[PDB]
Paper text:
To probe the molecular mechanisms responsible for AFP activity, we here characterized the antifreeze activity and crystal structure of TisAFP7 from the snow mold fungus Typhula ishikariensis.
The crystal structure of TisAFP7 was determined at 1.54 Å resolution by a molecular replacement method. The final structure was refined with R factor of 0.195 and Free R factor of 0.229, and was composed of 446 (223 × 2) residues and 746 solvent molecules. The refined TisAFP7 structure exhibited the root-mean–squared deviation (RMSD) of 0.37 Å and 0.34 Å from Cα atoms of TisAFP6 and TisAFP8, respectively, reflecting high sequence identities shared by the isoforms. Among the approximately 54 waters molecules on IBS, six water molecules were aligned in a small trough formed by the inward-facing hydrophobic residues (Val22, Val213, Val195, Val177, Leu150, and Val126) at the β-sheet region of IBS. To survey the bound water structure in the IBS loop region in detail, we next compared the structure of TisAFP7 with those of TisAFP6 and TisAFP8. In all these isoforms, 12 water molecules in corresponding positions formed a zigzag-pattern network with branches, shown by red spheres in Fig. 6a.
Author numbering: 1 to 223
Write the structure that this text describes.
């Protein structure tokens, strides 16, 4: 049940892929790669980077995986151009899907809900002021098309019920994404603009932002 998948292509190789900046207030805990392009590695800030021997990737104690930037040694720039391309394809694929199963459902107030598999369209901002559940089997899909901003309120959490997988949940957000302090998010975020994860928040999924990503001692676990 649910809509056809949004293939991420090589964007699915990153916990965080951004185009303009990635910032962190230590100590973030990222499991997976962090890539930035076409901005240079100087737009990865707060990571206390160490450039590795080849000059093609760097490391941070805040990242289990490699960081890469557009200015790093061949072949890292080419890798990242293809990843950024694949992110753009993915975002457009998800944003342009027709025939939603849910239209303006709950006026975009997801607190206390249990969301069944489907394509969801809101011509609005979406938010949750209370915990909510995404409920379906390990093979069910969700696409959340959001024309406005996406938020998740401080300390609030998204629960997976029924065997639902984060990698099967796609948030396609045109507006800014703000995950408030201590909140726990589930899903892949295909963001047209900025994404922010505030102090002690967590996300199981990926952050694929066409502008900036801002972390504040945040946990990002690739799914």
């Amino acid at each position: 049940a649910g809509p056809t998948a949004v293939p991420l292509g090589t964007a699915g190789n990153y916990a965080i892929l951004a185009s303009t900046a990635v910032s962190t207030v230590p100590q973030s805990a990222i499991t997976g790669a962090v890539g930035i392009s076409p901005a240079a590695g100087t737009f990865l800030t707060g990571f206390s980077l160490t450039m590795s021997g080849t000059g093609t990737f760097s490391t941070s104690t805040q990242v289990t995986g490699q960081l890469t930037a557009a200015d790093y040694g061949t072949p890292t720039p080419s890798i990242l151009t293809t990843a950024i391309g694949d992110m753009g394809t993915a975002y457009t694929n998800g944003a342009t899907r027709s025939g939603p199963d849910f239209l303006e459902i709950y006026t975009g107030a997801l607190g206390g809900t249990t969301l069944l598999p489907g394509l969801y369209k809101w011509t609005s901002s979406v938010g949750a002021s209370a915990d909510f559940t995404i409920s379906g089997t390990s093979t069910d899909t969700w696409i959340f098309q959001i024309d406005g901003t996406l938020g998740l309120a401080a300390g609030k959490k998204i629960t997976l019920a029924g065997g639902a997988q984060a990698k099967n949940i796609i948030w396609v957000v045109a507006g800014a994404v703000s995950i408030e302090a201590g909140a726990q998010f589930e899903g892949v975020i295909l963001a047209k603009t900025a994404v922010t994860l505030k102090t002690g928040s967590s996300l199981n999924g990926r952050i694929l932002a066409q502008t900036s990503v801002a972390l504040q001692s945040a946990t990002v676990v690739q799914k």
